[PDB]
Amino acid sequence: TLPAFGFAFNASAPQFASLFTPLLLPSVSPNPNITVPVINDTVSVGDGIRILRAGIYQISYTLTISLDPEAGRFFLSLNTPANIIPGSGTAVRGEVDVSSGVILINLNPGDLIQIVPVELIGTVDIRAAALTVAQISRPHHHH
Amino acid sequence: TLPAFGFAFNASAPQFASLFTPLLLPSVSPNPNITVPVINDTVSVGDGIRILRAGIYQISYTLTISPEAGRFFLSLNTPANIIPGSGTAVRSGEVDVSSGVILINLNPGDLIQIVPVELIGTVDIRAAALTVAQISRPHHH
């Protein structure tokens, strides 16, 4: 069968960051010529990606901030915004772009992956954002 | 069946950026010990990677760069045709930038390139690298 995956993004509706408020991600179709949903066995819920299939996933994200003091820190969260995932931090301290690392993680059916601001100084204008979820494996053996 | 993939980079030949000019990527063998091309069912054309098999791919890139500013995106087939989520930016020693990982449907022939979209000052690209790897066969019915 095919791996589970999803790509959910915002390229055309800026949003102000709010503490522990998931970023809006309304789009799933990044190809400008052949526009198709880049979703398979995940659900793009409007502000994140819900897992349908147990497995090991790669998760990561991007942001573009319209900077004018202004600072932000962001993480990925698991199910609720406070439940942040280690290795998923980004920070910002003209449009500037930030990208997270790639986190490998065991996820389960119903898990909801979101991008959340955890620290904000001044007003932070999110010009764009994108969340990447892709299955790398079935659940593996461990003790 | 193996996934399609390619890794094309420049580590040793700096280039001055210009608007909408794809960056040169002459190398495909990143391992310094066991130096082999990291290319399977893609083509490294000299300034990007061309897809040969339809599928969902992850695409991403890096740059090393030496008021001045530089903005870059990935483009699909033609330089102006930039891909959402693929921005990198440097606004002011060598500075490293990395894109996110974009998942996107690509068809045979699609050519992924790194392009500058905004430049102020002298932007010297000391190094660049483009990563393309197939996630899935097409997921349509």
Binding site: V36 | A54, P108, R137, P138
Partner: peptide
């Protein structure tokens, strides 16, 4: 030959 298209069907 397999290709994505505007006619491609999803769930």
């Amino acid at each position: 030959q397999e290709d994505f298209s505007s006619d491609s069907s999803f769930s």
